[PDB]
Point group: D2
Chain length 347, copies 4
């Protein structure tokens, strides 16, 4: 089968012709119908994941097939597989744990001590087929097609968990920063579907502000036009917001938005940008605010976003389909921030 | 009555002879049998509270009587007081809310938008009598005397809430920083009394290390003689700790102890020291750590620490009793870090 | 002023001409614009409340003006009232506590040991004016008029708390029993506005099933046509539901719907009907199900329902307006189950 | 190897000579050094487990080796086992899941839809060797030996979870019913080690009342000699208890102790006795009480109890060692309630 792989850091991905693994035991062989490409793969093609080394830290033994956003049809099931048959359309949770460590035992497998992340330190979906280590990481699609689902396994689970960490309820207000981008609109949609909280989206372009409104925000702010802190204060009648979700935070967002926090406000940071949080400690204790990080999500988060998306309660990302051969191209566009829409590789 | 009051910023407290207020409605006049003095009174005699101005921010109309650590016998009760009688020995929760704002409605009264903090922006216990705005803020002492209880209304409630925010259970490990000082040993005792978590105490002098161990720590570390991070790494088998309670944090502690956090770990900061939190953002997202602030506590936290103490499950702070007149003196020793043990004024 | 009061048990309410109280301190005098009437008032005109005696248990000193569903305009404010002004239209939370008991301290005021329930053991809104003990129990109306808001102070808060007790999230499914009734549709609307859970509504007539569908149920079951437990199994792929909300339970609902629960499922029961819960203990332990009671709610619950309603996120109850003098008739209609919609008296 | 097995329902267990399975993949073959025996095995020797049929319900293809309380040294590890070596002394969590169902995904593996319960529907520890389906279900013993640890896999995890379900804190009071039996003293110790709550222990013979007191109960009551309800109301000053943990409830306990519940009290039921819960529904709603079932526990509960025990924070159950050959004998003893102390078979 054809597979686009990381054979050497720095160097572009390489198309190879490798053997189609044979599924044994709980394993499932999936014929890939969609392989999402995201910013992570930009930093992945450079041998890193945030600031770790896939080789030194995650134990990657190059070459490795990339692609951690996976949906497709079951081609074959191992002999121990239960509850799935050839022909089933599924999405796959790639953030897999080994089972024995503390995080696996308490059901937070994505924080596993020795992670098995598909497409990061194990072969992924940039190929005609992909082995899923255990059938329990799958979700049968009934309403969504593969292209619609694949991005949910990464951006969907990430934003779903970030919304959960914002601890929202009907008495609260949420601020979503960068609310008109891919991640932002998804966070707005999920917060709207799952919380009852008032949702405020802030962005910096008229088009992105409109996308935030279309995604369901109750209020939107164009920070290039209005002082955002003053508009947040006006909307919340000087209370501030009870949570901020800052997806792909930057040095700028971290310096501005914590000031919009109400007492006990939670500032949820998502992403891997090389920026530092700088905050006056007394301001933290006096207001009991919290700064909390989030990345990807666990099996319950996967269940949650998949259930929302399958019920149509949240919508698929704006998508651009491309062929496998275009993998490097797709990633280049993400480097030059020339990727308008989630790129998904299709057969 | 006699009353030591902050009549002018900078200038030392003044011993005045003002009248004894008359208790009306749900108010309660307490004859002070113990007024604690703590570090906050040092930064108080300087017209501030962390970085605010009791006058401009907390609306303090000087002169204002200090003393937010209160315990005494009821002298007289308003006509709407129920369940308390003249003579009753009580401790008082000074962190009072007005009831109408968001924070009062959800039961977080200490975070009230228009706080009524006894001894901070309302007349405190640095006097012979003190008015408690509402009887519900009192707790009937049965086992403890005024001197032992008075510190609990500040240090006890503060550390009780900090332990709750650590979100501890038996599967977890807590690090208490400064574990051998006044606040540190209380935190250790409370954590040992209420969570079942493994408790590590760290301090910098052999004497403080012994006090932490005597307060119940499972493991104690002397950071002057050992590398706390290496010790913690082995105690937790490289996982790190699930919470750090940093009472009276500094630029130094904030720069060291966050590195001890396990994934999902909570760094609970308590106090008003002029230090800034500096932390690389990707470290926060990758490990899902949380920096959480905490100060004083609500009516539930007061009930909790008083119940523990009355049942002897947590012991009174080490105290040195003095006279009302020695107020300015008491606050001096705190300024010059010459005060060993909680100073308690006895009118 | 005119006031319809319970001057004797059994005997029908009595229209009296009493004096308009004077508001002092934190008290607020409201000019009633809407006094909701509900089933509770049936069991109230009979000196009871579930199984208690308002006189013996709640300390009711007859005569007492009924009316616990209250909205109107501020006529006058006590001298200590802050944040409200004459002419403000407000809804009132009647489930008030005294503040000192355990439940009040932990923020569960409706479960107070010495409750101050307006319209129950204190003068309520079946009159031209009503005294609210403390202004903090009010909520300013902007979107809603008094008639729309009054029922929310009872059915709204009750149902909102029931939904919170069901512990819903996007990975779960809820069953609302009697989903087409006034309380049932409110529960469906709230669950849809606040949770992300999949919602199944069940009722027993075609028109009721339609009402549940309009309220927002994802699935509906006509139990007069299909076996409801089998249909719930089909919908949930044999898992059962993670919660049941059974508002105004009967002997019939309690004998059938707990069987629909998934493992760990919560059966939230609301109401005072004289029925017994009857269930085989081993089934409870084997499935870890929970039976949980709920009645009315606290300040946070009131905040939540008013915020949803004021934002239009949940709709007001179908209402029939009547005159104060018709109070007895209104209650009669509830006894003869000839009441269509929530009856609201307008003085 | 020697293996006592349930070859036919009704008929007593049969000592057989079966081969020692070979551990493949993630499996681990353990050399049993302790096989606890508890009441469940009595109810098991009768093909049942509460009321089910291990064959019909749990898919038990007889003969099946009993023994769900497992501890011993690792004889051999599969080729996929990490973190454990031949020679390691371990305790085993028998309440295992398959991974794919909702309950496994959310980390509640004991509630798995297709449970793999060692000693119940999978071969247990009544043998010289036993296969563990996956190494993650193990815990390395450091301070405990096999005999001390094996019972924890059942009574320890069960009571640990019951205590968590009681939702305790320092402001609360817990009643443990059957407080002086093996399960009861474990529950008391755990509540004392992990909750801060005041503990009332009730039992029905003086020797058991004394054992409850030695286990940590603050108050103890002999329900044989004194009205337990009057005594509880005296101790709690009429508030009632905030939780009851009813270990091996009976028709008697369930008809009595719910009456001792405070408002919001949680009644935690543990066990499989043939009794019905009968309770007036209005009492449930008026007081917001909860009846909640609890059975065994999940991976996090197992981690918690093993941590407590390995730290000496709770003590091993009183045990009586016997030989594999006496399996039927031990179960007989439990049938005739002639068994004093947890019987542990040592092949
Ligand atoms: Zn991705
Ligand atoms: Zn792991
Ligand atoms: Zn203090
Ligand atoms: Zn307030
Ligand atoms: Zn009502
Ligand atoms: Zn109360
Ligand atoms: Zn057992
Ligand atoms: Zn399962």
């Amino acid at each position: 089968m054809r597979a686009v792989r990381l054979v050497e850091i720095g160097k572009p991905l390489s198309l190879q012709e490798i053997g189609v693994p044979k599924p044994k035991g709980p394993q499932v062989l999936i014929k890939v119908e969609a392989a999402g490409v995201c910013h992570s793969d930009v930093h992945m093609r450079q041998g890193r994941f945030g600031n770790l080394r896939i080789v030194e830290d995650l134990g990657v033994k190059l070459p490795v097939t990339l692609g951690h956003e996976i949906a497709g049809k079951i081609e074959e099931v191992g002999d121990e597989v239960v509850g799935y048959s050839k022909g089933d359309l599924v999405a796959v949770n790639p953030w897999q744990g080994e089972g024995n460590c503390y995080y696996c035992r308490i059901g937070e497998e994505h924080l596993c001590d020795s992670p098995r992340w598909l497409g990061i330190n194990f072969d992924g979906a940039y190929a005609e087929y992909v082995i899923v280590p255990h059938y329990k990481y799958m979700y049968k699609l009934r309403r969504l097609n593969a292209v619609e689902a694949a991005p949910l396994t990464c951006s969907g689970i990430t934003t779903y968990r970030a919304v959960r960490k914002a601890s929202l309820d009907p008495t609260k207000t949420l601020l979503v920063v960068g609310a008109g981008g891919g991640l932002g609109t998804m966070a707005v949609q999920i917060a709207k579907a799952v919380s009852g909280a008032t949702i405020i989206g802030v962005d910096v372009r008229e088009e992105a502000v409109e996308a935030a409104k279309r995604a369901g925000a109750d209020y939107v702010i164009n920070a290039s036009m209005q002082d955002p802190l003053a508009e947040i204060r006006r909307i919340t009648e000087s209370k501030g917001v009870d949570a901020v979700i800052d997806l792909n935070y930057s040095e700028k967002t971290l310096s501005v938005y914590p000031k919009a926090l109400a007492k006990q406000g939670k500032y949820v940071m998502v992403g891997l940008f090389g920026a530092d949080l700088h905050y006056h400690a007394p301001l933290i204790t006096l207001s009991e605010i919290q700064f909390v990080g989030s990345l990807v999500g666990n099996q319950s988060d996967f269940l949650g976003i998949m259930r929302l998306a399958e019920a149509g309660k949240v919508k698929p990302m704006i998508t651009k389909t491309m062929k496998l051969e275009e993998a490097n191209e797709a990633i280049d566009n993400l480097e030059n921030f020339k990727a308008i829409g989630r790129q998904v590789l299709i057969p």
